Amino acid sequence: LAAFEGPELHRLPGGWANVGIWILIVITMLMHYDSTLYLARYSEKVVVPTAVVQFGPYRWVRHPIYASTMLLFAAYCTALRAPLSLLFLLAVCLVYYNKKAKMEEELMVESFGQSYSDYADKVRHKFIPFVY
Amino acid sequence: LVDWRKVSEKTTLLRPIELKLVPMALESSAFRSKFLDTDELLSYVSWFA
């Protein structure tokens, strides 16, 4: 639907309008790599978190890898200039990804207790900074 | 905020240069209490340097 909706590849503008796209790409890959490096550092096994992570992207958004992945698709829908698909992936990705976030969060709240409780009190905003 | 009477009762066997370097160690050990990482502090220290 993004490819259908977006204008033809020669009609979309360039110059100083394609510099924001580069900004979005680089900030996405910074946030995702920082989140991954912070999450994988504290796990002894492949996915077994020893402690509670609250650093970098974790002090802004409780689930930063997920947000970074969606922001990748959002920048992608901005690239071919199709905002309608951006909104629809917002809806569907938010729904599924919130479901998995709830399952994961309830698991590690059960397994950790007060630490992730006060951490989630510190950062309520779960996916987008002060939007949700 | 610091009750300096307790600190003075804790540094009795020391000397004036140690009395001068006491607040440095107090700030270090007070920042020790929280749970924090290393690499972010290196990053901010290097940036502010």
Curated annotation (Swiss-Prot), chain B:
UniProt similarity note: In the N-terminal section; belongs to the AAA ATPase family.
Entry protein name: Probable inactive ATP-dependent zinc metalloprotease FTSHI 5, chloroplastic
Chain segments annotated as coiled-coil in the UniProt record: none
Gene (name only): FTSHI5
Consequence of gene disruption: Embryo defective.
Subcellular location: Plastid, Chloroplast membrane
Interval of the full protein contained in this chain: 979 to 1027 of 1320
Physiological role: Required for plastid development during embryogenesis. Might be involved in chaperone functions or play a structural role in the thylakoid FtsH complex.
Organism: Arabidopsis thaliana
Subunit structure, interactors included: Oligomer.
